[PDB]
């Protein structure tokens, strides 16, 4: 399903797909999941994370 995202935590590539580590709203740190970029509809949170690397 589609859930609200609280923060993007990390980024990786697995089997040719870009993935982002998502912290879900209402979920805990145990609920974080890696989701491919096609699953993501949180551009503001993605950009904040990438800008936050550097």
């Amino acid at each position: 399903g589609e859930f609200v995202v609280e923060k993007v935590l990390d980024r990786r590539v697995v089997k040719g797909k870009v993935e982002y580590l998502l912290k879900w709203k209402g979920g805990s740190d145990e609920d974080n999941t890696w989701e491919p970029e096609e699953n993501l509809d949180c551009p503001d949170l993605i950009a904040e994370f990438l800008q936050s690397q550097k």
């Binding site: 609280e6 989701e35 509809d41």
Partner: peptide
């Protein structure tokens, strides 16, 4: 806007 994502 609403920050959402699909969960696999």
């Amino acid at each position: 806007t609403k920050q959402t994502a699909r969960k696999s």
